[PDB]
DNA sequence: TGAGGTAGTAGGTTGTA
DNA sequence: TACAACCTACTACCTCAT
DNA sequence: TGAGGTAGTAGGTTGTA
DNA sequence: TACAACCTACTACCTCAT
């Protein structure tokens, strides 16, 4: 089979126990808590003594050479205590930080073209390289004509074991930056009203957008009684305004919104935010060109990290610590156990389907009882386009036809829909006010001959005249009518395509229509392990200080949705309260007992993120009820990438490819081709349970492949994935009694 | 008529412009913001210089005598600038703080019984008196045998006009305190496991409850490596542990829960929280005895504040400023305009009702269409008690009978209910687990012959075996069946009463049953002013970091509920977002157009609290739609009390009694007899609108008197009152389409 | 919002304590 | 205050080919 | 949770900036 | 950090008397 490896390079030779200088931080201020100042004391002693290595154990600072005890800090009186050779066996993380410091100090001395520094070193795990290794294996500055920089952004994490052997865990991202601030764009004369920007002279994390450009110069005394240059000199920041010339004083004052009031900054201090949108708006050719540079398959990630490690080389102050430029041939050397999980068997109306598109030839597994009467909203200037769109949808669903012809790929009577262009209604709506959208949706429910809406909304782009998706879905949630919304662009694809491109649009639209009416296209034939129901718990954070409700979804062992429970009250944080856990799991056991006749003997709880809930509550709750339960932490955001090494040839791994060490597991659930990036695996760890992680990973990978809303699988299992979809459609939850209908899909 | 006055005493003579010493606070720390340290600098310069008057203007400190510039503070370098006689016309608040300082300094020198200080002065607006003026006009220490103190808690607010004349606005509350800490209760030997306590050695505001009492002494070195006395000496707080004796070192360590982890305090530092519950549990006779001392009618409040002002007397450092000991005979001298608002005319089935209890003789105004089938849950050991309870409810509602006899006060066929003890179901439920409560409610909806539930729940007290209200109301909200819950004690009142006491129980239960099925008992005959709909906006805060959704209720001009809108997403703060305002008021105009055929020409928005929303949004939204709108800020919590002075005789004001100065208005909406306290008026101000405040106050007082869930009126208007009731029943909102049924009631 | 993925940009929450 | 793991939101790009 | 009020205890959020 | 107006939660007490 294909071996699996991670982005890791083995260190040649070990590190020795070396002399450290233990320092003490005490709470010199009005407080006495040193834990709230330990990292600040580390950073100030590192920065105030020409960037020399300072490390952190629980209350102490450790240093590789003799530095004077600093009383100059007002918050931290760092003082020498003793001189101790720390052993490797008790100080793994400290020697990991030592190795990453010496990697940083070795890479600071590396140059490109003999003049330019290659790496931007701040002596951290994060390393920005000013140049990029290209696909043709050449270090090149990726700049544009408009000053946009692309920088390869490395993240090192060396791990030292008890013997001193070092394993350099690596990853690489991209970094969008620019050297042109707003002063240079005003010297050039660019439209800067409304740009999302950041201030390089403050560390405050907040959305900064430009209101306008005032004609007042920065040297003129402002509305606060003093000028802005005087305002920067009074803030003990006169060194930033010291190098300003007379032409710099002729800069126009650019006021900037800081989400509470109008801030007043100078245009030299503010730098624009280089998103994909800004980069595409200003220089679209450069944003085309870096598409193969930011979306890196595992071979080009290996070549990038190989060039990085060749730039590291030998480290003469760690007993000649050099790193290999090859990945491990297997992760068994790293403790992981690798493999591939077998594909789920998906059942249809005619039996096993080999692909998800064969469900439109075989027919869906469960059609809901009853006839589905359509209704259609569409904007008024898009009439015949919407005619052709609903014509294509109905010919796909009922009459089994694509482009008017009966197709071998499509079965007749996929969904028992009822749409007659004489009988069914086409209510057109004028684009415009939001209350007119809401009244148009209420007007379409004025006629009781509509059981499902195929409303055509404008594009999610085109920031002009308001989108009707949000008012339509809110009103149809208030009215408990399901609805599949469609952009104007998708309707124009249905009107204007002659190839089979719109067929896949039709596949996903009809799977949406089916899931929203309680139908099921495919089911699992058999789930691995002894499980009765799946619960996917999640708490999402919409904004600052706003949390989504602790959404749960309930599945059976075959992965069809029994239930979802949105608690009506929000909570304080990402931990679910035991009262909310009471609500959720009483709803779980009630729904499983309603559809099955008894309590579930086995529950697997897929907690999205960390299972920070009280485990003693869970043990009491399911031990009083004779329920064996399992808590699996399914985690989305993880910088770890899995490769497939095959006689030294790095490639993207297939879906179902996992690595497993202990309870932590990284599993690839997406099959992503080269020149489209590399697959982001799911970090999966078991916080509680007694099922082995092979069963848990097989169940999670089975739950990824049974996403009933698309013909291609979800990256997340639909426990945590449908919890995310309900957190997205949280203002769109239908009013009436909770059932199998998947509104969020 | 009866004059209205406020708790205010006029000052005899004026204050002169006096010499101030303007000081400067600069941001000496790593920050430069002086507004975040101005009050701390005021307090430290006040405390570090033997409690001398320090005042705050926007960035400056003002002082009445020459104090040295203090550089000892690490955060504030307070420095003298200039010496200026501030004029009265520009510095109203500063001279108000001067007068309140000199009142504090005059009252510090006042003694009771020649030995004991009367007042506890911290030189603020708040003044605790150690003694109480009793009802018999005698200064007496209100102590108990268990160390519980009652203290009269004054709040002064002198107001100086431009001429220097001073008006002492006053109020008085009570203060529950004790002198016995947990060290003295352990020396006495009291049960202290589980007590809600506070630490007198920290200013952190949080719930502190005792987990247990450890046998470890406080002198023994703890689990942190150091003892607790060493922990207080290391925190620069060795003066608190300096006076401890050997018997103090034999105190047991009392660990205390601080909502995140176990804190470890000594029992001398922790003081128990003296609530009404703790006071009633320990010394119930003293809590009986102070009922007429904390709930003070306006005459006893006048006598208390009169004794307070007689203790103030003449102030020789404010040009002999003495205060009167009489209220104003009218608030026209204070700028207010007083009066009484006419009573609302309540219409019934037979016409105008003079009292709300005549609606049970005349019949209700609107019965809903259809027959209402009861269903009853009750706990199993309370069977015949629940038989008699539902017997009394059905004899009141349908057969018009009280205690089995046809009553002249009760009309036959009040509500078209259907309850046959042979046909209707009595599902009994075992008290116990919450999931058994939820399954009992689902079992009562297993039979489809129930349209309303009269479920009998256990008491809200009796912290033993779990209350079933919350699971029942959650499940019946999931099932869209309305339900009137009843305690076991109320059912025992229906079973065991022979007088007309349970008749009022029956009145409020049947008004609840009527409002929850969409019926309306009474309506307004005519509303004052040109208004089409009332909107009551509110955002509630359940806990720290948790906000209730921005609930709105919609009324017509006659005060019957058109609509309520709970947004599905929570928000960050008490300001309603303009997207949420879009949702709310589109729902408002849609509901008024659905029940009336057009948009409302006039809207009055009763915002509970502050109308902190964007007024430009409102003006744009209702100006594009040709709607004149009004925003009234109806405010619950206000220390201001209105009196009725009648030839110098102070008494409680009637309901509908208002005072009005400008846009701010205080209106008494509750008719509260003497020896039951004094009425808390509603602070009401118009943030936007063009209706006069007499119309706004008449509409608010009309909206108080049409609370359809009780035979006695609500203090709040049912705009803000029903917004509060939906915020309380926020996890109890029924699933199906929003209608006239008042679930929250 | 056809669906799903990769990618950056930005902002959080919590635990480490 | 501060990073490490986790999140969320938004936007490009890219593809979909029994 | 019959309903409503007054009362304390406690904890917030925001604006003042 | 800090008070001033506003809130919320909880608990006692008290009453209800056409
Ligand atoms: Mn989520
Ligand atoms: Mn969808
Ligand atoms: Mn409220
Ligand atoms: Mn009620």
Tab-separated table of N, CA and C in Angstrom, chain B residues 194-275:
chain	number	residue	atom	x	y	z
B	194	UNK	N	-21.947	25.186	52.628
B	194	UNK	CA	-22.868	25.618	51.598
B	194	UNK	C	-23.386	27.032	51.731
B	195	UNK	N	-22.820	27.843	52.620
B	195	UNK	CA	-23.295	29.208	52.782
B	195	UNK	C	-22.727	30.110	51.697
B	196	UNK	N	-23.592	30.932	51.106
B	196	UNK	CA	-23.143	31.994	50.220
B	196	UNK	C	-22.500	33.090	51.055
B	197	UNK	N	-21.226	33.374	50.784
B	197	UNK	CA	-20.431	34.276	51.606
B	197	UNK	C	-19.756	35.303	50.709
B	198	UNK	N	-19.104	36.271	51.345
B	198	UNK	CA	-18.244	37.218	50.656
B	198	UNK	C	-16.956	37.378	51.442
B	199	UNK	N	-15.899	37.758	50.739
B	199	UNK	CA	-14.616	38.042	51.360
B	199	UNK	C	-14.508	39.544	51.572
B	200	UNK	N	-14.294	39.951	52.820
B	200	UNK	CA	-14.092	41.360	53.128
B	200	UNK	C	-12.671	41.831	52.865
B	201	UNK	N	-11.799	40.967	52.354
B	201	UNK	CA	-10.419	41.338	52.090
B	201	UNK	C	-10.124	41.443	50.601
B	202	UNK	N	-11.148	41.358	49.753
B	202	UNK	CA	-10.990	41.522	48.318
B	202	UNK	C	-12.203	42.257	47.769
B	203	UNK	N	-12.011	42.914	46.629
B	203	UNK	CA	-13.073	43.651	45.959
B	203	UNK	C	-13.647	42.904	44.764
B	204	UNK	N	-13.305	41.627	44.594
B	204	UNK	CA	-13.768	40.869	43.440
B	204	UNK	C	-15.235	40.508	43.627
B	205	UNK	N	-16.059	40.860	42.643
B	205	UNK	CA	-17.493	40.605	42.688
B	205	UNK	C	-17.770	39.249	42.049
B	206	UNK	N	-18.094	38.262	42.878
B	206	UNK	CA	-18.388	36.928	42.388
B	206	UNK	C	-19.062	36.106	43.463
B	207	UNK	N	-19.731	35.047	43.016
B	207	UNK	CA	-20.479	34.166	43.905
B	207	UNK	C	-19.505	33.278	44.670
B	208	UNK	N	-19.437	33.462	45.987
B	208	UNK	CA	-18.565	32.677	46.851
B	208	UNK	C	-19.414	31.820	47.776
B	209	UNK	N	-19.337	30.503	47.602
B	209	UNK	CA	-20.029	29.553	48.464
B	209	UNK	C	-19.007	28.600	49.070
B	210	UNK	N	-19.271	28.168	50.299
B	210	UNK	CA	-18.357	27.282	51.009
B	210	UNK	C	-18.556	25.854	50.519
B	211	UNK	N	-17.462	25.210	50.106
B	211	UNK	CA	-17.522	23.789	49.792
B	211	UNK	C	-17.595	22.952	51.063
B	212	UNK	N	-16.631	23.124	51.961
B	212	UNK	CA	-16.532	22.320	53.177
B	212	UNK	C	-15.672	23.081	54.182
B	213	UNK	N	-15.341	22.413	55.283
B	213	UNK	CA	-14.438	22.941	56.301
B	213	UNK	C	-13.327	21.917	56.484
B	214	UNK	N	-12.108	22.291	56.111
B	214	UNK	CA	-10.970	21.393	56.244
B	214	UNK	C	-10.486	21.371	57.686
B	215	UNK	N	-9.980	20.214	58.119
B	215	UNK	CA	-9.416	20.091	59.458
B	215	UNK	C	-8.027	20.703	59.569
B	216	UNK	N	-7.425	21.095	58.449
B	216	UNK	CA	-6.108	21.712	58.462
B	216	UNK	C	-6.187	23.112	59.061
B	217	UNK	N	-5.250	23.425	59.951
B	217	UNK	CA	-5.172	24.750	60.546
B	217	UNK	C	-4.529	25.724	59.567
B	218	UNK	N	-4.768	27.019	59.795
B	218	UNK	CA	-4.323	28.035	58.843
B	218	UNK	C	-2.822	28.274	58.965
B	219	UNK	N	-2.228	27.891	60.099
B	219	UNK	CA	-0.792	28.081	60.276
B	219	UNK	C	0.010	26.972	59.608
B	220	UNK	N	-0.619	25.830	59.346
B	220	UNK	CA	0.077	24.716	58.721
B	220	UNK	C	0.315	25.025	57.242
B	221	UNK	N	1.492	24.688	56.701
B	221	UNK	CA	1.778	25.002	55.294
B	221	UNK	C	0.911	24.198	54.336
B	222	UNK	N	0.309	24.907	53.389
B	222	UNK	CA	-0.788	24.393	52.589
B	222	UNK	C	-0.271	23.582	51.402
B	223	UNK	N	-1.176	23.283	50.464
B	223	UNK	CA	-0.814	22.515	49.278
B	223	UNK	C	-0.007	23.332	48.277
B	224	UNK	N	-0.004	24.661	48.404
B	224	UNK	CA	0.789	25.507	47.521
B	224	UNK	C	2.234	25.655	47.980
B	225	UNK	N	2.645	24.942	49.030
B	225	UNK	CA	3.988	25.038	49.555
B	225	UNK	C	4.163	26.048	50.666
B	226	UNK	N	3.257	27.014	50.785
B	226	UNK	CA	3.303	28.020	51.834
B	226	UNK	C	1.957	28.063	52.541
B	227	UNK	N	1.966	28.530	53.786
B	227	UNK	CA	0.737	28.608	54.558
B	227	UNK	C	-0.100	29.804	54.115
B	228	UNK	N	-1.326	29.869	54.638
B	228	UNK	CA	-2.231	30.949	54.256
B	228	UNK	C	-1.818	32.271	54.887
B	229	UNK	N	-1.301	32.235	56.119
B	229	UNK	CA	-0.837	33.459	56.770
B	229	UNK	C	0.399	33.996	56.055
B	230	UNK	N	1.270	33.090	55.598
B	230	UNK	CA	2.377	33.488	54.734
B	230	UNK	C	1.871	34.001	53.390
B	231	UNK	N	0.733	33.478	52.921
B	231	UNK	CA	0.164	33.942	51.659
B	231	UNK	C	-0.415	35.346	51.792
B	232	UNK	N	-0.928	35.694	52.975
B	232	UNK	CA	-1.406	37.060	53.168
B	232	UNK	C	-0.258	38.017	53.469
B	233	UNK	N	0.828	37.529	54.078
B	233	UNK	CA	1.980	38.405	54.285
B	233	UNK	C	2.725	38.665	52.980
B	234	UNK	N	2.724	37.697	52.061
B	234	UNK	CA	3.409	37.895	50.790
B	234	UNK	C	2.649	38.820	49.846
B	235	UNK	N	1.345	39.009	50.055
B	235	UNK	CA	0.519	39.860	49.206
B	235	UNK	C	0.499	41.313	49.676
B	236	UNK	N	1.512	41.721	50.455
B	236	UNK	CA	1.594	43.030	51.120
B	236	UNK	C	0.368	43.315	51.986
B	237	UNK	N	-0.165	42.276	52.632
B	237	UNK	CA	-1.331	42.395	53.500
B	237	UNK	C	-1.056	41.778	54.865
B	238	UNK	N	0.158	41.968	55.387
B	238	UNK	CA	0.516	41.400	56.675
B	238	UNK	C	-0.113	42.101	57.859
B	239	UNK	N	-0.689	43.285	57.645
B	239	UNK	CA	-1.329	44.013	58.737
B	239	UNK	C	-2.638	43.353	59.152
B	240	UNK	N	-3.283	42.630	58.232
B	240	UNK	CA	-4.530	41.952	58.569
B	240	UNK	C	-4.272	40.723	59.432
B	241	UNK	N	-3.149	40.035	59.199
B	241	UNK	CA	-2.799	38.860	59.988
B	241	UNK	C	-1.882	39.191	61.156
B	242	UNK	N	-1.591	40.472	61.390
B	242	UNK	CA	-0.668	40.838	62.459
B	242	UNK	C	-1.332	40.730	63.827
B	243	UNK	N	-2.610	41.094	63.919
B	243	UNK	CA	-3.316	41.089	65.194
B	243	UNK	C	-3.889	39.727	65.563
B	244	UNK	N	-3.572	38.674	64.813
B	244	UNK	CA	-4.105	37.354	65.124
B	244	UNK	C	-3.387	36.750	66.325
B	245	UNK	N	-4.164	36.144	67.215
B	245	UNK	CA	-3.641	35.502	68.408
B	245	UNK	C	-3.358	34.028	68.125
B	246	UNK	N	-3.044	33.286	69.191
B	246	UNK	CA	-2.808	31.853	69.049
B	246	UNK	C	-4.108	31.106	68.789
B	247	UNK	N	-5.209	31.574	69.383
B	247	UNK	CA	-6.512	30.967	69.135
B	247	UNK	C	-6.983	31.255	67.713
B	248	UNK	N	-6.555	32.388	67.150
B	248	UNK	CA	-6.868	32.697	65.759
B	248	UNK	C	-6.122	31.768	64.807
B	249	UNK	N	-4.936	31.301	65.207
B	249	UNK	CA	-4.185	30.366	64.377
B	249	UNK	C	-4.743	28.950	64.442
B	250	UNK	N	-5.598	28.652	65.420
B	250	UNK	CA	-6.290	27.372	65.487
B	250	UNK	C	-7.577	27.351	64.672
B	251	UNK	N	-7.787	28.334	63.801
B	251	UNK	CA	-8.967	28.348	62.951
B	251	UNK	C	-8.831	27.327	61.831
B	252	UNK	N	-9.933	26.648	61.531
B	252	UNK	CA	-9.928	25.653	60.471
B	252	UNK	C	-9.973	26.332	59.109
B	253	UNK	N	-9.244	25.768	58.145
B	253	UNK	CA	-9.250	26.306	56.790
B	253	UNK	C	-10.596	26.025	56.137
B	254	UNK	N	-11.246	27.083	55.661
B	254	UNK	CA	-12.548	26.992	55.016
B	254	UNK	C	-12.353	27.295	53.538
B	255	UNK	N	-12.413	26.261	52.706
B	255	UNK	CA	-12.283	26.433	51.268
B	255	UNK	C	-13.607	26.901	50.673
B	256	UNK	N	-13.519	27.723	49.629
B	256	UNK	CA	-14.662	28.476	49.126
B	256	UNK	C	-14.658	28.435	47.599
B	257	UNK	N	-15.829	28.186	47.014
B	257	UNK	CA	-15.942	28.079	45.566
B	257	UNK	C	-16.012	29.454	44.918
B	258	UNK	N	-15.157	29.672	43.922
B	258	UNK	CA	-15.116	30.945	43.230
B	258	UNK	C	-15.433	30.838	41.753
B	259	UNK	N	-16.323	29.895	41.407
B	259	UNK	CA	-16.953	29.700	40.096
B	259	UNK	C	-15.981	29.217	39.015
B	260	UNK	N	-14.703	29.101	39.328
B	260	UNK	CA	-13.739	28.500	38.415
B	260	UNK	C	-12.896	27.428	39.086
B	261	UNK	N	-12.496	27.641	40.336
B	261	UNK	CA	-11.683	26.681	41.065
B	261	UNK	C	-11.871	26.923	42.554
B	262	UNK	N	-11.322	26.011	43.351
B	262	UNK	CA	-11.445	26.106	44.800
B	262	UNK	C	-10.461	27.145	45.316
B	263	UNK	N	-10.987	28.221	45.889
B	263	UNK	CA	-10.180	29.200	46.598
B	263	UNK	C	-10.000	28.734	48.033
B	264	UNK	N	-8.989	29.272	48.698
B	264	UNK	CA	-8.589	28.793	50.016
B	264	UNK	C	-8.417	30.009	50.922
B	265	UNK	N	-9.475	30.354	51.654
B	265	UNK	CA	-9.494	31.522	52.522
B	265	UNK	C	-9.552	31.089	53.980
B	266	UNK	N	-9.205	32.020	54.862
B	266	UNK	CA	-9.289	31.797	56.303
B	266	UNK	C	-10.676	32.247	56.757
B	267	UNK	N	-11.249	31.678	57.827
B	267	UNK	CA	-12.635	32.031	58.180
B	267	UNK	C	-12.785	33.406	58.809
B	268	UNK	N	-11.691	34.075	59.171
B	268	UNK	CA	-11.803	35.448	59.646
B	268	UNK	C	-12.061	36.411	58.494
B	269	UNK	N	-11.614	36.058	57.291
B	269	UNK	CA	-11.722	36.924	56.126
B	269	UNK	C	-13.083	36.866	55.452
B	270	UNK	N	-13.810	35.766	55.598
B	270	UNK	CA	-15.066	35.556	54.897
B	270	UNK	C	-16.236	35.910	55.802
B	271	UNK	N	-17.218	36.603	55.231
B	271	UNK	CA	-18.418	37.056	55.901
B	271	UNK	C	-19.620	36.521	55.132
B	272	UNK	N	-20.646	35.990	55.799
B	272	UNK	CA	-21.787	35.435	55.060
B	272	UNK	C	-22.665	36.516	54.445
B	273	UNK	N	-23.363	36.137	53.378
B	273	UNK	CA	-24.268	37.041	52.675
B	273	UNK	C	-25.605	37.048	53.399
B	274	UNK	N	-26.050	38.228	53.813
B	274	UNK	CA	-27.287	38.353	54.583
B	274	UNK	C	-28.377	38.698	53.576
B	275	UNK	N	-28.956	37.667	52.978
B	275	UNK	CA	-30.143	37.832	52.158
B	275	UNK	C	-31.379	37.773	53.045
